[PDB]
């Protein structure tokens, strides 16, 4: 069992506000098959999905000087099923005009996804769904979008105020601040890890892997599969603008994955620092090709 550092010394989780009416945004965008989107290149040789699900990350409430409580949606109450898998699309509508969610508008920026994959799911003591039992595999972006951590461990909820096993609990979220956690040269790689440790305690960690990612503004696709050997990660290093997945890591996960969870995110910023963020899409990998080599696909039905 690896060592992951200490745990949070805070005695009360930060307050979280949940809203849906201000978060139910209609941005209809289907998927076109002949776009080289979410197509995993065959492995070992050289020669597939729909509106989908949308997830929004927004900065928390704030005043003129000091930021207020967080602001998330009910992206943790809903729990979905892994089945064969799903395809991940990030950085869709950047470089354009978007509202700050919280009339005001700005340029849309890019965000990175965090996942929690496990086999047994229930609900908390309060009666709210989103609790994962036994081992869980968590993929957490770190370093203000310049690092990815992937660990395998059990999660124990905490009994402080606003924490999952405490009083007056709405949801658990990740947060970070741009003034301190992100800086030129002096980037903090353990911000979101500390935000995660604020709510849950990580016990019996079999493995913890790190991958370094360069900053960009490129629309991206991602995927994860499981076979008899282990969990295969399908991204960047070989293809960057064509959107063709490739393998970069194998994770020793032998239990069957049946459910996955998305973790909401927020940035502690004041009104003058509000920047709009990009919607993050996930499409079901229902089991159902023109080459250039890279593929540049038509639905049979």
């Amino acid at each position, epitope marked *: 069992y690896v060592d992951v550092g200490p745990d949070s010394v*805070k005695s*009360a989780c930060i*307050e979280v506000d949940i809203q849906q009416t201000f978060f139910d945004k209609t941005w209809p965008r289907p998927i076109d098959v002949s776009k080289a989107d979410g197509i995993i290149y065959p492995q070992g040789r050289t020669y597939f999905p729909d509106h989908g699900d949308m997830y929004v990350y927004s900065a928390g409430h704030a005043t003129g000087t000091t*930021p207020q409580k967080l602001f998330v949606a009910n992206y943790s109450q809903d729990v979905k099923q892994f089945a064969n898998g799903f395809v991940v699309r990030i950085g869709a509508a950047a470089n354009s005009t978007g509202t700050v969610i919280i009339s005001t508008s700005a340029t849309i920026r890019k965000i990175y996804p965090a996942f929690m994959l496990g086999s047994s799911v229930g609900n908390f003591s309060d009666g709210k769904m989103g609790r994962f039992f036994n081992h869980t595999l968590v993929l957490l972006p770190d370093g203000c979008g310049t690092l990815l951590r992937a660990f395998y461990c059990i999660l124990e909820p905490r009994s*402080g*105020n606003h924490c999952p*096993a*405490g009083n007056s609990y709405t949801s658990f979220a990740t947060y970070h601040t741009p003034a*301190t956690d992100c800086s030129d040269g002096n980037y903090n790689r353990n911000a979101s890890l500390n935000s995660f440790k604020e709510y849950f305690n990580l016990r019996n960690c079999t493995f913890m892997y790190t991958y370094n990612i360069t900053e960009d503004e490129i629309l991206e696709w991602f995927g994860i599969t499981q076979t008899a050997q282990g969990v295969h990660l399908f991204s960047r290093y070989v293809d960057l603008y064509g959107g063709n997945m490739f393998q970069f890591a194998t994770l020793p996960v032998y239990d069957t994955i049946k459910y996955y969870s998305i973790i909401p995110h927020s940035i502690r910023s004041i009104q003058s620092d509000r920047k709009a963020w990009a919607a993050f899409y996930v499409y079901k990998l229902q089991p159902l090709l023109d080459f250039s080599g890279y593929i540049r696909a038509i639905d049979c039905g």
Partner: antibody
Amino acid sequence: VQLVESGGGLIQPGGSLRLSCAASGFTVIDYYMTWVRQAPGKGLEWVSVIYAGGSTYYADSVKGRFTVSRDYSRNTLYLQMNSLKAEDTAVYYCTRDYLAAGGLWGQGALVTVSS
Amino acid sequence: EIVLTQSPSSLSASVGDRVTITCRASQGIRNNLAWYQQKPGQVPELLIYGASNLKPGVPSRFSGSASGTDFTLTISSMQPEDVATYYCQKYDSAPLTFGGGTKLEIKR
């Protein structure tokens, strides 16, 4: 990390006052902070709490007279007292969140309400 | 409303004894009970968080105990130094109510 307080002295009854607590080594917005008073020769008492997210909770014996806030730019914690009476004469402290509520503690400021 | 009754309010100790204090409450507070130590003439300090966990600053002699309904703050051995006033607090919810502080002494 340290906390230094100021703003205490003799005050006539029926008048206001302010207490300021300056924090070094961290930022105020990270952790919740608590104002706690202690009467001379009596026990400890909890005056107010401010949580990350601007949610403030006051005690019943001080409700309607005291107010707690904080300033981000100066990294300060403020407590304003109005309609003071002779009962509100005590040593006050500002405390920072840690393993427990009172992990860091402060130095103390004496407030005397008399004519 | 949850009330925190710290007993005994005055503690008499000898050259040989193990401090044992209790903190009765009228409701459920999860385990969010904090035990503080105040040397008279100085600001108090934290002893134990969660009624069973130890602060890294404090040593391992002052060992907490379980909390069924009452909360026991045990101490392995009695020393001339440990003379202070020990306080309870419930940081479980909005009213963080205190109680009475128990003065310790050394036999002579």
